[PDB]
């Protein structure tokens, strides 16, 4: 159209989306083929400028069980988006190239995750913004590698994860930021707005207190 559905801005065929709305402790998820014509403002919609996808998750958003952090985020799928993606870090070459911008941060604890590699146990490495400091994490180390302490909101950057030979190479605007040793399988990509704050550590407890990310390009390949 291509301004009516996020699926018109990015190829969401091999993805599903998890939202910050839903019943108590049960974040709603939308899978293909319904995802092809799905939108829910302001959490998951084409942005006003019709150039990308807006992902927003407020601190009072619905979270698993009721405890945890809210998100409006894509989860990698495969086979026409029919099943969950799961790949090896020691076999094959797995790449995700994305272009995004962090647009808004929650109050008090201005932390927001915009892309990640996750496995069967937890997050492996993610692009995490804290204020104006953008980091590439490593497991529980939220400050593994500082990309820049001068990240300006709404600035589009290109991130890339390349996994092969038991190593994860992470790039920011074409420059290698860090290489992380990782040999477990069951990995998958994610991209969107995963707000690292809830009503227990951020006030006010309102939908107007949120993290937001805009995704302009999203490409995943496996060989």
């Amino acid at each position: 159209e291509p301004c009516d559905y996020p699926a018109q801005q990015l190829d969401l065929t091999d993805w599903k989306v998890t939202l910050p709305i839903g019943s108590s402790g049960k974040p709603s998820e939308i899978e293909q083929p319904a995802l092809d014509t799905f939108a829910t403002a302001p959490w998951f919609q084409v942005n006003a400028k019709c150039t990308g996808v807006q992902f927003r998750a407020a601190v009072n958003g619905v979270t698993t069980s009721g405890s945890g952090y809210p998100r409006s985020e894509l989860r990698e799928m495969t086979d026409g988006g029919e099943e969950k993606a799961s790949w090896s870090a020691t076999s094959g070459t797995h790449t995700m190239v994305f272009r995004e911008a962090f647009n808004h941060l929650p109050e008090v604890k201005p932390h927001l995750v915009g892309a990640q590699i996750h496995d069967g146990d937890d997050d492996v490495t993610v692009f995490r913004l804290e204020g104006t400091s953008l980091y590439i994490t490593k497991g529980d180390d939220t400050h593994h590698k500082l990309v820049t302490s001068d990240y300006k909101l709404n600035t589009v950057f290109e991130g890339k994860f390349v996994v092969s030979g038991g190593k994860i190479k992470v790039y920011y605007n074409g420059v290698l930021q860090t290489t992380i040793s990782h040999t477990s399988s069951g990995n998958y990509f994610k991209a969107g707005a995963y707000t690292q704050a809830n009503c227990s550590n951020s006030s006010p407890c309102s939908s107007s207190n949120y993290g937001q990310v805009s995704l302009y390009k999203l490409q995943v390949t496996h060989s």
Side-chain angles (χ1 to χ4, degrees), residues 69-93:
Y69 291 134
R71 80 189 78 219
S72 181
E73 180 183 50
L74 301 172
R75 193 281 197 217
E76 192 195 355
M77 302 293 279
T78 189
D79 184 46
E82 292 302 312
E83 57 175 55
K84 298 176 181 178
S86 176
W87 39 268
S88 168
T90 57
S91 167
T93 302

PDB file of all heavy atoms in Angstrom, residues 69-93:
ATOM      1  N   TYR A  69       9.636  -7.948  31.743  1.00  0.00           N
ATOM      2  CA  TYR A  69       9.622  -6.735  30.935  1.00  0.00           C
ATOM      3  C   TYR A  69       8.745  -6.885  29.694  1.00  0.00           C
ATOM      4  O   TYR A  69       8.711  -7.945  29.064  1.00  0.00           O
ATOM      5  CB  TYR A  69      11.050  -6.350  30.540  1.00  0.00           C
ATOM      6  CG  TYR A  69      11.883  -5.869  31.711  1.00  0.00           C
ATOM      7  CD1 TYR A  69      13.188  -6.323  31.905  1.00  0.00           C
ATOM      8  CD2 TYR A  69      11.376  -4.931  32.609  1.00  0.00           C
ATOM      9  CE1 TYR A  69      13.967  -5.849  32.965  1.00  0.00           C
ATOM     10  CE2 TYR A  69      12.142  -4.457  33.669  1.00  0.00           C
ATOM     11  CZ  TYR A  69      13.434  -4.916  33.842  1.00  0.00           C
ATOM     12  OH  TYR A  69      14.185  -4.425  34.889  1.00  0.00           O
ATOM     13  N   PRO A  70       8.025  -5.813  29.328  1.00  0.00           N
ATOM     14  CA  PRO A  70       7.127  -5.778  28.171  1.00  0.00           C
ATOM     15  C   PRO A  70       7.840  -5.594  26.838  1.00  0.00           C
ATOM     16  O   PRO A  70       8.934  -5.027  26.775  1.00  0.00           O
ATOM     17  CB  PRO A  70       6.211  -4.609  28.496  1.00  0.00           C
ATOM     18  CG  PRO A  70       7.162  -3.643  29.124  1.00  0.00           C
ATOM     19  CD  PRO A  70       7.994  -4.526  30.049  1.00  0.00           C
ATOM     20  N   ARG A  71       7.201  -6.053  25.768  1.00  0.00           N
ATOM     21  CA  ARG A  71       7.798  -5.944  24.449  1.00  0.00           C
ATOM     22  C   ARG A  71       6.780  -5.916  23.322  1.00  0.00           C
ATOM     23  O   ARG A  71       5.637  -6.340  23.479  1.00  0.00           O
ATOM     24  CB  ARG A  71       8.717  -7.144  24.201  1.00  0.00           C
ATOM     25  CG  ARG A  71       7.964  -8.415  23.785  1.00  0.00           C
ATOM     26  CD  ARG A  71       8.877  -9.622  23.766  1.00  0.00           C
ATOM     27  NE  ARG A  71       9.120 -10.143  25.109  1.00  0.00           N
ATOM     28  CZ  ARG A  71      10.294 -10.599  25.531  1.00  0.00           C
ATOM     29  NH1 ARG A  71      11.345 -10.588  24.722  1.00  0.00           N
ATOM     30  NH2 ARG A  71      10.411 -11.093  26.755  1.00  0.00           N
ATOM     31  N   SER A  72       7.231  -5.383  22.192  1.00  0.00           N
ATOM     32  CA  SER A  72       6.494  -5.394  20.932  1.00  0.00           C
ATOM     33  C   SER A  72       7.704  -5.789  20.102  1.00  0.00           C
ATOM     34  O   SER A  72       8.532  -4.947  19.752  1.00  0.00           O
ATOM     35  CB  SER A  72       5.987  -4.026  20.503  1.00  0.00           C
ATOM     36  OG  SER A  72       5.283  -4.192  19.282  1.00  0.00           O
ATOM     37  N   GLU A  73       7.811  -7.072  19.793  1.00  0.00           N
ATOM     38  CA  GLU A  73       9.013  -7.560  19.145  1.00  0.00           C
ATOM     39  C   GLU A  73       8.784  -8.767  18.248  1.00  0.00           C
ATOM     40  O   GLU A  73       7.962  -9.634  18.555  1.00  0.00           O
ATOM     41  CB  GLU A  73      10.000  -7.906  20.275  1.00  0.00           C
ATOM     42  CG  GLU A  73      11.370  -8.443  19.903  1.00  0.00           C
ATOM     43  CD  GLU A  73      12.187  -8.807  21.142  1.00  0.00           C
ATOM     44  OE1 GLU A  73      11.657  -9.524  22.021  1.00  0.00           O
ATOM     45  OE2 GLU A  73      13.361  -8.386  21.244  1.00  0.00           O
ATOM     46  N   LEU A  74       9.525  -8.818  17.145  1.00  0.00           N
ATOM     47  CA  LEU A  74       9.438  -9.925  16.201  1.00  0.00           C
ATOM     48  C   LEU A  74      10.316 -11.082  16.674  1.00  0.00           C
ATOM     49  O   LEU A  74      11.407 -10.871  17.216  1.00  0.00           O
ATOM     50  CB  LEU A  74       9.896  -9.474  14.813  1.00  0.00           C
ATOM     51  CG  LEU A  74       9.116  -8.322  14.179  1.00  0.00           C
ATOM     52  CD1 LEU A  74       9.820  -7.869  12.906  1.00  0.00           C
ATOM     53  CD2 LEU A  74       7.690  -8.758  13.883  1.00  0.00           C
ATOM     54  N   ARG A  75       9.827 -12.298  16.458  1.00  0.00           N
ATOM     55  CA  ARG A  75      10.519 -13.525  16.839  1.00  0.00           C
ATOM     56  C   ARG A  75      10.697 -14.342  15.559  1.00  0.00           C
ATOM     57  O   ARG A  75       9.727 -14.620  14.851  1.00  0.00           O
ATOM     58  CB  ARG A  75       9.665 -14.281  17.858  1.00  0.00           C
ATOM     59  CG  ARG A  75      10.359 -15.410  18.597  1.00  0.00           C
ATOM     60  CD  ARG A  75      10.475 -16.692  17.787  1.00  0.00           C
ATOM     61  NE  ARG A  75      10.764 -17.810  18.681  1.00  0.00           N
ATOM     62  CZ  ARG A  75      11.559 -18.832  18.386  1.00  0.00           C
ATOM     63  NH1 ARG A  75      12.164 -18.895  17.207  1.00  0.00           N
ATOM     64  NH2 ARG A  75      11.752 -19.793  19.281  1.00  0.00           N
ATOM     65  N   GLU A  76      11.934 -14.726  15.264  1.00  0.00           N
ATOM     66  CA  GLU A  76      12.237 -15.462  14.041  1.00  0.00           C
ATOM     67  C   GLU A  76      11.513 -16.793  13.881  1.00  0.00           C
ATOM     68  O   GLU A  76      11.521 -17.638  14.779  1.00  0.00           O
ATOM     69  CB  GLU A  76      13.747 -15.700  13.928  1.00  0.00           C
ATOM     70  CG  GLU A  76      14.177 -16.208  12.554  1.00  0.00           C
ATOM     71  CD  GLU A  76      15.581 -16.780  12.532  1.00  0.00           C
ATOM     72  OE1 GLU A  76      16.283 -16.702  13.560  1.00  0.00           O
ATOM     73  OE2 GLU A  76      15.980 -17.313  11.474  1.00  0.00           O
ATOM     74  N   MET A  77      10.900 -16.974  12.719  1.00  0.00           N
ATOM     75  CA  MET A  77      10.194 -18.202  12.392  1.00  0.00           C
ATOM     76  C   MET A  77      10.825 -18.749  11.116  1.00  0.00           C
ATOM     77  O   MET A  77      11.785 -18.180  10.595  1.00  0.00           O
ATOM     78  CB  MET A  77       8.708 -17.916  12.163  1.00  0.00           C
ATOM     79  CG  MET A  77       7.997 -17.276  13.349  1.00  0.00           C
ATOM     80  SD  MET A  77       7.853 -18.352  14.802  1.00  0.00           S
ATOM     81  CE  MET A  77       6.421 -19.342  14.342  1.00  0.00           C
ATOM     82  N   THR A  78      10.291 -19.855  10.617  1.00  0.00           N
ATOM     83  CA  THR A  78      10.810 -20.454   9.398  1.00  0.00           C
ATOM     84  C   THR A  78       9.700 -21.223   8.689  1.00  0.00           C
ATOM     85  O   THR A  78       8.619 -21.415   9.247  1.00  0.00           O
ATOM     86  CB  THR A  78      12.003 -21.393   9.709  1.00  0.00           C
ATOM     87  OG1 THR A  78      12.625 -21.794   8.484  1.00  0.00           O
ATOM     88  CG2 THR A  78      11.542 -22.623  10.470  1.00  0.00           C
ATOM     89  N   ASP A  79       9.970 -21.643   7.456  1.00  0.00           N
ATOM     90  CA  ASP A  79       9.006 -22.383   6.644  1.00  0.00           C
ATOM     91  C   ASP A  79       7.713 -21.589   6.467  1.00  0.00           C
ATOM     92  O   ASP A  79       6.629 -22.048   6.824  1.00  0.00           O
ATOM     93  CB  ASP A  79       8.706 -23.747   7.276  1.00  0.00           C
ATOM     94  CG  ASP A  79       7.784 -24.596   6.421  1.00  0.00           C
ATOM     95  OD1 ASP A  79       8.015 -24.674   5.197  1.00  0.00           O
ATOM     96  OD2 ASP A  79       6.832 -25.191   6.972  1.00  0.00           O
ATOM     97  N   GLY A  80       7.840 -20.389   5.911  1.00  0.00           N
ATOM     98  CA  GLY A  80       6.675 -19.549   5.696  1.00  0.00           C
ATOM     99  C   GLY A  80       6.071 -19.043   6.993  1.00  0.00           C
ATOM    100  O   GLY A  80       4.881 -18.739   7.054  1.00  0.00           O
ATOM    101  N   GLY A  81       6.895 -18.957   8.033  1.00  0.00           N
ATOM    102  CA  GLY A  81       6.424 -18.479   9.322  1.00  0.00           C
ATOM    103  C   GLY A  81       5.583 -19.493  10.072  1.00  0.00           C
ATOM    104  O   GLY A  81       4.908 -19.148  11.039  1.00  0.00           O
ATOM    105  N   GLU A  82       5.638 -20.749   9.635  1.00  0.00           N
ATOM    106  CA  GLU A  82       4.863 -21.825  10.248  1.00  0.00           C
ATOM    107  C   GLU A  82       5.452 -22.397  11.534  1.00  0.00           C
ATOM    108  O   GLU A  82       4.720 -22.905  12.382  1.00  0.00           O
ATOM    109  CB  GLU A  82       4.666 -22.962   9.243  1.00  0.00           C
ATOM    110  CG  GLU A  82       3.773 -22.612   8.064  1.00  0.00           C
ATOM    111  CD  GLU A  82       2.386 -22.178   8.495  1.00  0.00           C
ATOM    112  OE1 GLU A  82       1.779 -22.876   9.334  1.00  0.00           O
ATOM    113  OE2 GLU A  82       1.901 -21.143   7.992  1.00  0.00           O
ATOM    114  N   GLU A  83       6.769 -22.335  11.680  1.00  0.00           N
ATOM    115  CA  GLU A  83       7.394 -22.866  12.884  1.00  0.00           C
ATOM    116  C   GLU A  83       8.509 -21.980  13.406  1.00  0.00           C
ATOM    117  O   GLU A  83       9.042 -21.135  12.687  1.00  0.00           O
ATOM    118  CB  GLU A  83       7.928 -24.279  12.636  1.00  0.00           C
ATOM    119  CG  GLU A  83       8.925 -24.398  11.504  1.00  0.00           C
ATOM    120  CD  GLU A  83       9.497 -25.798  11.390  1.00  0.00           C
ATOM    121  OE1 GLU A  83       8.704 -26.756  11.275  1.00  0.00           O
ATOM    122  OE2 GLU A  83      10.738 -25.941  11.413  1.00  0.00           O
ATOM    123  N   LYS A  84       8.853 -22.180  14.672  1.00  0.00           N
ATOM    124  CA  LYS A  84       9.901 -21.405  15.317  1.00  0.00           C
ATOM    125  C   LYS A  84      11.275 -21.726  14.748  1.00  0.00           C
ATOM    126  O   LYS A  84      11.609 -22.890  14.522  1.00  0.00           O
ATOM    127  CB  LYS A  84       9.904 -21.683  16.821  1.00  0.00           C
ATOM    128  CG  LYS A  84       8.624 -21.284  17.533  1.00  0.00           C
ATOM    129  CD  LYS A  84       8.672 -21.673  19.001  1.00  0.00           C
ATOM    130  CE  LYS A  84       7.388 -21.293  19.718  1.00  0.00           C
ATOM    131  NZ  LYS A  84       7.414 -21.705  21.148  1.00  0.00           N
ATOM    132  N   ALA A  85      12.069 -20.688  14.512  1.00  0.00           N
ATOM    133  CA  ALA A  85      13.414 -20.876  14.000  1.00  0.00           C
ATOM    134  C   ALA A  85      14.290 -21.386  15.135  1.00  0.00           C
ATOM    135  O   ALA A  85      14.089 -21.036  16.299  1.00  0.00           O
ATOM    136  CB  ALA A  85      13.963 -19.562  13.462  1.00  0.00           C
ATOM    137  N   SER A  86      15.255 -22.226  14.780  1.00  0.00           N
ATOM    138  CA  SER A  86      16.191 -22.806  15.730  1.00  0.00           C
ATOM    139  C   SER A  86      17.422 -23.218  14.937  1.00  0.00           C
ATOM    140  O   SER A  86      17.360 -24.145  14.129  1.00  0.00           O
ATOM    141  CB  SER A  86      15.571 -24.033  16.398  1.00  0.00           C
ATOM    142  OG  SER A  86      16.503 -24.659  17.261  1.00  0.00           O
ATOM    143  N   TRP A  87      18.539 -22.532  15.148  1.00  0.00           N
ATOM    144  CA  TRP A  87      19.744 -22.870  14.409  1.00  0.00           C
ATOM    145  C   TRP A  87      21.004 -22.981  15.253  1.00  0.00           C
ATOM    146  O   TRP A  87      21.090 -22.471  16.375  1.00  0.00           O
ATOM    147  CB  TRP A  87      19.967 -21.885  13.249  1.00  0.00           C
ATOM    148  CG  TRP A  87      19.640 -20.456  13.560  1.00  0.00           C
ATOM    149  CD1 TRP A  87      18.441 -19.827  13.368  1.00  0.00           C
ATOM    150  CD2 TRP A  87      20.518 -19.479  14.132  1.00  0.00           C
ATOM    151  NE1 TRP A  87      18.520 -18.520  13.783  1.00  0.00           N
ATOM    152  CE2 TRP A  87      19.782 -18.280  14.257  1.00  0.00           C
ATOM    153  CE3 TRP A  87      21.855 -19.501  14.551  1.00  0.00           C
ATOM    154  CZ2 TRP A  87      20.338 -17.111  14.787  1.00  0.00           C
ATOM    155  CZ3 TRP A  87      22.409 -18.337  15.079  1.00  0.00           C
ATOM    156  CH2 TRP A  87      21.648 -17.157  15.191  1.00  0.00           C
ATOM    157  N   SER A  88      21.982 -23.671  14.678  1.00  0.00           N
ATOM    158  CA  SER A  88      23.266 -23.937  15.302  1.00  0.00           C
ATOM    159  C   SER A  88      24.267 -22.801  15.167  1.00  0.00           C
ATOM    160  O   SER A  88      24.254 -22.061  14.188  1.00  0.00           O
ATOM    161  CB  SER A  88      23.862 -25.204  14.685  1.00  0.00           C
ATOM    162  OG  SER A  88      25.218 -25.375  15.051  1.00  0.00           O
ATOM    163  N   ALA A  89      25.144 -22.674  16.157  1.00  0.00           N
ATOM    164  CA  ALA A  89      26.176 -21.648  16.127  1.00  0.00           C
ATOM    165  C   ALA A  89      27.486 -22.247  15.609  1.00  0.00           C
ATOM    166  O   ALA A  89      28.424 -21.517  15.294  1.00  0.00           O
ATOM    167  CB  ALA A  89      26.383 -21.069  17.525  1.00  0.00           C
ATOM    168  N   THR A  90      27.538 -23.575  15.511  1.00  0.00           N
ATOM    169  CA  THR A  90      28.737 -24.279  15.055  1.00  0.00           C
ATOM    170  C   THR A  90      28.614 -24.912  13.669  1.00  0.00           C
ATOM    171  O   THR A  90      29.571 -25.497  13.155  1.00  0.00           O
ATOM    172  CB  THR A  90      29.135 -25.387  16.048  1.00  0.00           C
ATOM    173  OG1 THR A  90      28.041 -26.297  16.212  1.00  0.00           O
ATOM    174  CG2 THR A  90      29.497 -24.789  17.398  1.00  0.00           C
ATOM    175  N   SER A  91      27.433 -24.803  13.072  1.00  0.00           N
ATOM    176  CA  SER A  91      27.183 -25.345  11.743  1.00  0.00           C
ATOM    177  C   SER A  91      26.432 -24.288  10.954  1.00  0.00           C
ATOM    178  O   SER A  91      25.436 -23.758  11.437  1.00  0.00           O
ATOM    179  CB  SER A  91      26.331 -26.616  11.834  1.00  0.00           C
ATOM    180  OG  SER A  91      25.816 -26.995  10.565  1.00  0.00           O
ATOM    181  N   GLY A  92      26.915 -23.978   9.754  1.00  0.00           N
ATOM    182  CA  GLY A  92      26.257 -22.988   8.921  1.00  0.00           C
ATOM    183  C   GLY A  92      26.637 -21.551   9.218  1.00  0.00           C
ATOM    184  O   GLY A  92      27.423 -21.273  10.125  1.00  0.00           O
ATOM    185  N   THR A  93      26.068 -20.639   8.437  1.00  0.00           N
ATOM    186  CA  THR A  93      26.313 -19.209   8.578  1.00  0.00           C
ATOM    187  C   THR A  93      24.945 -18.555   8.731  1.00  0.00           C
ATOM    188  O   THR A  93      24.093 -18.657   7.847  1.00  0.00           O
ATOM    189  CB  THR A  93      27.041 -18.656   7.340  1.00  0.00           C
ATOM    190  OG1 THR A  93      28.280 -19.359   7.173  1.00  0.00           O
ATOM    191  CG2 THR A  93      27.330 -17.171   7.502  1.00  0.00           C
TER     192      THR A  93
END
